[PDB]
Amino acid sequence: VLSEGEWQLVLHVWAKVEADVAGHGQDILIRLFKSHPETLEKFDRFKHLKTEAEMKASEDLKKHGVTVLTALGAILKKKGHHEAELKPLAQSHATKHKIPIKYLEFISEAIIHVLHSRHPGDFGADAQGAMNKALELFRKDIAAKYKELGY
Numbered sequence: 001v002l003s004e005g006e007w008q009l010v011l012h013v014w015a016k017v018e019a020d021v022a023g024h025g026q027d028i029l030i031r032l033f034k035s036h037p038e039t040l041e042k043f044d045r046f047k048h049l050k051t052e053a054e055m056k057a058s059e060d061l062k063k064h065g066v067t068v069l070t071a072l073g074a075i076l077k078k079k080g081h082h083e084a085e086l087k088p089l090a091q092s093h094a095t096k097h098k099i100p101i102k103y104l105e106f107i108s109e110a111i112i113h114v115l116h117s118r119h120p121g122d123f124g125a126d127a128q129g130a131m132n133k134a135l136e137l138f139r140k141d142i143a144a145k146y147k148e149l150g151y
């Protein structure tokens, strides 16, 4: 589990993200889609986007980026007790959207990359290690639910 100090580093940089949820959402999803094209194929809403410029110009993508980061924010703020927040997410992503745990690892990488780009001062090695731990916890718990339903 993460220590109180680790959660503090995670939430300190996350407070910086909340100042521009939409901007962060775009960078993260675009990074995910470009680095791992197979993830884009999972979104019927975004499959038509063929260039980074098109992705950046999509208000629909920006809207989803907010949805994603808002859900993640609520999870991170629950620190070591995010059971209630994960249930609906793990459920939909396993059976409805069919998102393998590996894709959650990909988006975690994208999140960490964008955080470093936008908040280097509050995202040094210690904060980076803490965020990695928080995102690993997120994936681990979702994975447990995935195994439960046989996905």
Ligand code: HEM
Residues within 6 Å of the ligand: 039, 040, 042, 043, 044, 045, 067, 068, 069, 071, 072, 088, 089, 092, 093, 097, 099, 103, 104, 107
């Ligand atoms: C930080 C990790 C993620 C979070 C917090 C997150 C959160 C959400 C939320 C809140 C929704 C809308 C409600 C729902 O259906 O549950 C959603 C929908 C969806 N997510 Fe995620 N998601 C994450 C990662 C991913 C990844 C990695 C993929 C695909 C590779 C993905 C694919 C989808 C799809 C396809 C939908 C349905 C979109 C639609 O039809 O409008 N998500 N996600």
